């Protein structure tokens, strides 16, 4: 079966009435199945829409509006899935098919359109107008012997769901990769995604991974792995592209840094941004819009901050900055420069590397800490040097108790909080240093893995006066807080999942909360051993 992407332009018109039709044909030419919506609009009179005879199915919605053509031959349209709706809850909407020229739509022969799978219908302003898992009709009592499936299809077969990628192994209590499993390309179960398509994080085969996800490769097949946090978005820095003749980050350009994670260039924050420059028709920047930069984790060039919100205590907007590569440097010298700011702490608690270029922290009369860092740790290139000059004296900073926290290591801090330490004196929980992990007390219970506390599995049972786990897994528990499926603490026994031989496996609860196998005869559930279960 031939497949086209579809369209979602709505009542939009693509160019001249001729340009609109010329682009409608190229998409829906020889197409048999529409993955998206079938949108027929602004079709003029005497325009041959005869290529629409090939269409056998539509997944999304169908739209026929503002057409003055006499005939729209949908003589083979067998099904409308209604994956989407056009407006409100109309899966099929045929609206205002006429013109002020006295020529509307006469013939809409949808002779084969038996079922609409989802959604209602809307008709207005048109003056001239069997198995168990099947859908349209049936050329037999079986499932294969059906015209079109209801849910999915898998080589003639009309299943309600595609064969799972994995099947529960009742032996080792683990999962195994199903050799009969297939991806869900449209309402079809294909053993492999088609040409130039990508696997979802679960199941289907789509051309675009989309947001919150990126494209990774696994077993020769490009898949769509979810983005750990915001997806990576490279962006141009000051001086480049959008900001060619730009002097600083200003109220104008600040918006374009939205959702950026990596800056390909430099980053300048100068006082002119806060004053505004009439000579460039640039208004004052409101400091709050700096929060946009919180998504920035890396900078290829340098970071220059000569101006900063006086009421803001630290470089908050860079709390997530991880690295400055210093591939480009101020005066060929500096990769980090912070001069004459009101801040009290730098606050770069996520900074772990400055690959090249020198550091200059100068004139911040209230700036404490800063001298506690051993910047050698951050440097990657030799000859890199720091200059920390004319900021607030250590002794003044002591008098007001602005010193690295007691849980910080001697390596220093970016500020007074435990989450500002460079490294921890004992252990860390999250991005925070602490005294001890919750081994024998506290919520949640956890275990240590390299100077770090890690939450025990929530299915492990807290032991008074002892530990509760040894590893991230539920197999590493000591006592299962609820049920047990072999080496596995569980909140519910396995009941309904598929297995080998294409049989849904069932389990029940032994009074010791241990999951055991029901009798094979019991297929819809069971609450005990023997036949008496079901």
């Amino acid at each position, epitope marked *: 079966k031939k497949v086209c992407q579809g369209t979602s332009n709505k009542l939009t018109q693509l160019g001249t009435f001729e340009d609109h039709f010329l682009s409608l044909q190229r998409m829906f030419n020889n197409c048999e199945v529409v993955l998206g919506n079938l949108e027929i609009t602004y079709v003029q009179r005497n325009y041959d829409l005869s290529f629409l005879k090939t269409i056998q199915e539509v997944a999304g919605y169908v739209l026929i509006a503002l057409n003055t053509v006499e005939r729209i031959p949908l003589e083979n349209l067998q099904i409308i899935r209604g994956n989407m709706y056009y407006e409100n809850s109309y899966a099929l909407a045929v609206l205002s098919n006429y013109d002020a020229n006295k020529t509307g739509l006469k013939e809409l022969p949808m002779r084969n359109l038996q079922e609409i799978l989802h959604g209602a219908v809307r008709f207005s302003n048109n003056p001239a107008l069997c198995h168990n898992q099947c859908a349209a009709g049936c050329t037999g009592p079986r499932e294969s012997d059906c015209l079109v499936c209801r849910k999915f299809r898998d080589e003639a077969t009309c299943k309600d769901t595609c064969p799972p990628l994995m099947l529960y192994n009742p032996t080792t209590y683990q999962m195994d990769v199903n050799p009969e499993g297939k991806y869900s390309f449209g309402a079809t179960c294909v053993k492999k995604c088609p040409r130039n398509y990508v696997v979802t994080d679960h199941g289907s085969c789509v051309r675009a991974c989309g947001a919150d996800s990126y494209e990774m490769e696994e077993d020769g097949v490009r898949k769509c792995k979810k983005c750990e946090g915001p997806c990576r978005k490279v962006c141009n820095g000051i001086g480049i592209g959008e900001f060619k003749d730009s002097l600083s980050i200003n109220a104008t350009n600040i918006k374009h840094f939205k959702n950026c994670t990596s800056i390909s260039g430099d980053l300048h924050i*100068l*006082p*002119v941004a806060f*004053r505004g420059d009439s000579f460039t028709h640039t208004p004052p920047l409101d400091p709050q819009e700096l929060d946009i930069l919180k998504t920035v984790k890396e900078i290829t060039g340098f970071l220059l901050i*000569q*101006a900063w919100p006086e009421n803001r205590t630290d470089l908050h907007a860079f709390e997530n900055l991880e690295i400055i590569r210093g591939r480009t440097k*101020q*005066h060929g*010298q*500096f990769s980090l*420069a912070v*001069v*004459s700011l009101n801040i009290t702490s730098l606050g770069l608690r996520s900074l772990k590397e400055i690959s090249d270029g020198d550091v*200059i922290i*100068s*004139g*911040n*009369k209230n700036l404490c800490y800063a001298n506690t860092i051993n910047w050698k740790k951050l440097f990657g290139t030799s000859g890199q040097k720091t*200059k920390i*000059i*004319s*900021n*607030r*004296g*250590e*002794n*003044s900073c002591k008098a007001t108790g602005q010193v690295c926290h007691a849980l910080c290591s001697p390596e220093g801090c970016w500020g007074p909080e435990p989450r500002d330490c460079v490294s921890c004196r004992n252990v860390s929980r999250g991005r925070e240093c602490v005294d001890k992990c919750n081994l024998l007390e506290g919520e949640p219970r956890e275990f240590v893995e390299n100077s770090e506390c890690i939450q025990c599995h929530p299915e492990c049972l807290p032991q008074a006066m002892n530990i509760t786990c040894t590893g991230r897994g539920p197999d590493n528990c000591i006592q299962c807080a609820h049920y047990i499926d072999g080496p596995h603490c569980v909140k519910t026994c396995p009941a309904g999942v598929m297995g080998e031989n294409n049989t849904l496996v069932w389990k029940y609860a032994d009074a010791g909360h241990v999951c055991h196998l029901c009798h094979p005869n019991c297929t819809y559930g069971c609450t005990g051993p023997g036949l008496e279960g079901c």
Partner: antibody
């Protein structure tokens, strides 16, 4: 060659205001700040304040209320302004530039302006 | 704030002698110390930056040592040209501050 050349009247009446122009050469005010330093015959060398390259200022604590330094990167000159002078404000006032960016190793000095405070 | 203490106050010296100007800082500031020379009716002249780093144009006989609190400016063989006041400057605590100077007189 780098030069700081300053011009300004050095006789200011008590309670009145002092004005000095530091005219720069050999470098741009857009890449370097200009510092101000005075020297009384008794109380030694004292740093008054700065006009950084970006146009932002920074004044020493005992001068916040009565000091204003502005400039003109085009005309390449800097304008020192201090108000309500008294007898103790009698000194030689200097403008200075540091050898290196953002730093304070004052390698380049104006000739100084001898301010006398008297009626 | 921080105090730069210079000693001695006046220092008389015959030509050829060795000279040591002391600048002790009340707090420890590593090497954030500069030295200046100021001759009669003249502007100060940067001699040494960051405790020991030499400046171009300044003769070799001038040198600086020390770190933390105790700093030193040295002349290995004094000449009559060297008559002036000598000041030390701290770069570490805001605002930058100057010592009260040492006067170099010469015997003859």
């Amino acid at each position: 060659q780098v030069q700081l050349k300053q011009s300004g009247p050095g006789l200011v009446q008590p309670s009145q205001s002092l004005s000095i122009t530091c005219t720069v050469s050999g470098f741009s005010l857009t890449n370097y700040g200009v510092h101000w330093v005075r020297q009384s015959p008794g109380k030694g060398l004292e740093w008054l304040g700065v006009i950084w390259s970006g146009g932002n200022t920074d004044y020493n604590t005992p001068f916040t209320s009565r000091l204003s330094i502005n400039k003109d990167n085009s005309k390449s000159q800097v304008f020192f302004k201090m108000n309500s002078l008294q007898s103790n404000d009698t000194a030689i006032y200097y403008c200075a530039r540091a050898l290196t960016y953002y730093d304070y190793e004052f390698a380049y000095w104006g000739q100084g302006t001898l301010v006398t405070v008297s009626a | 704030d921080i105090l730069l203490t210079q000693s001695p106050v006046i220092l008389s010296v015959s030509p050829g002698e060795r000279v040591s100007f002391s600048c002790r800082a009340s707090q420890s500031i590593g090497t954030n110390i500069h030295w200046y020379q100021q001759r009669t009716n003249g502007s100060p002249r940067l001699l040494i930056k960051y405790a020991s780093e030499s400046i171009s144009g300044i003769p070799s006989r001038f040198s600086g040592s020390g770190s933390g609190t105790d700093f030193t400016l040295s002349i290995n063989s004094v000449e009559s040209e060297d008559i002036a006041d000598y000041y030390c400057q701290q770069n570490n605590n805001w605002p930058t501050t100057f010592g009260a100077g040492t006067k170099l007189e010469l015997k003859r």
